[PDB]
Design a protein around this ligand. Structure first.
Ligand SMILES: CC(C)(C)c1cc(C(=O)/C=C/c2ccc(C(=O)O)cc2)cc(C(C)(C)C)c1
Lengths: 228, 9
């Protein structure tokens, strides 16, 4: 378990450094389905989070030993997954809000009008589902890593290497959740099932991106185009 | 994927 403890700490640190927790942030607040002012802020903040997700990925042990082609394949396939999980860990239930990394705090109607559109209730439902899991940074980070380092994405050159980079992450999460939450013994398969729930939402989100492109005034920001 | 290469290297 010293190699496991090192892995958990590395991943916890990588998530923490690239994603402040809800309690650390100073919140601030601000006819047609897409409010272009909210869309502008939302797409800018998402761009910055994609950059932070890349910085998180590079700190995951082994990730940079994959070929560049596969690093890019993995990041593109997990982009919406990780963005959606991240914003869903910034949910305040008593105000029904989500808080972005600059502190911008939007309620459900505003999230709807920023771009989630018909996917708003689905995404807010998923955030509500995460709350009873009481995930800490190590757990959110490991779930993010497990979701990113997935050997079944299309067009991977070395999928077996990706699976073998993922298996230490799964074992770390299994061990960690046992030593943290012995009264919560089905918690590991419960959190892995959220990844599967998350893939379903992100598949619908990829559909929504096509409609958004037809609706926004100009172009998607360049990095978002690359990722999506 | 120009920006993404830069970010990774
Ligand atoms: C599902 C849907 C509507 C298609 C979609 C969802 C998201 C999303 O979930 C943004 C997550 C996020 C953003 C910022 C921060 C932060 O500021 O920390 C955290 C998490 C993003 C988009 C794009 C990339 C703008 C097209 C599209």
């Amino acid at each position: 378990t010293p190699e496991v403890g090192e892995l958990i700490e590395k991943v916890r640190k990588a998530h923490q450094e690239t994603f402040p927790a809800l309690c650390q942030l100073g919140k601030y607040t601000t006819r047609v389905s897409l409010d272009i002012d909210l869309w502008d802020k939302f797409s800018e903040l998402s761009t910055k989070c994609i950059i932070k997700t890349v910085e998180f990925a590079k700190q995951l042990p082994g990730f940079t030993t994959l070929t560049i082609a596969d690093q890019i394949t993995l990041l593109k396939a997990a982009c919406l997954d990780i963005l959606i999980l991240r914003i869903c860990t910034r949910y305040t239930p008593e105000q029904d809000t989500m808080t972005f990394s600059d502190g911008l705090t939007l309620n459900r109607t505003q999230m709807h009008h920023a771009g989630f559109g018909p996917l708003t209730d689905l995404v807010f439902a998923f955030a509500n589902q995460l709350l009873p899991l009481e995930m800490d940074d190590a757990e959110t980070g490991l779930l993010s890593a497990i979701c990113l380092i997935c050997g079944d994405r299309q067009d991977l050159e070395q999928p077996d290497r990706v699976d073998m980079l993922q298996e230490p992450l799964l074992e770390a999460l299994k061990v960690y959740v046992r030593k943290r939450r012995p009264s919560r013994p089905h918690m590991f398969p419960k959190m892995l099932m959220k990844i599967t729930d998350l893939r379903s939402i992100s598949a619908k989100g990829a559909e929504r991106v096509i409609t958004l492109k037809m609706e926004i005034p100009g172009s998607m920001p360049p990095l978002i185009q690359e990722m999506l | 994927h120009k920006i993404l290469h830069r970010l990774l290297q």
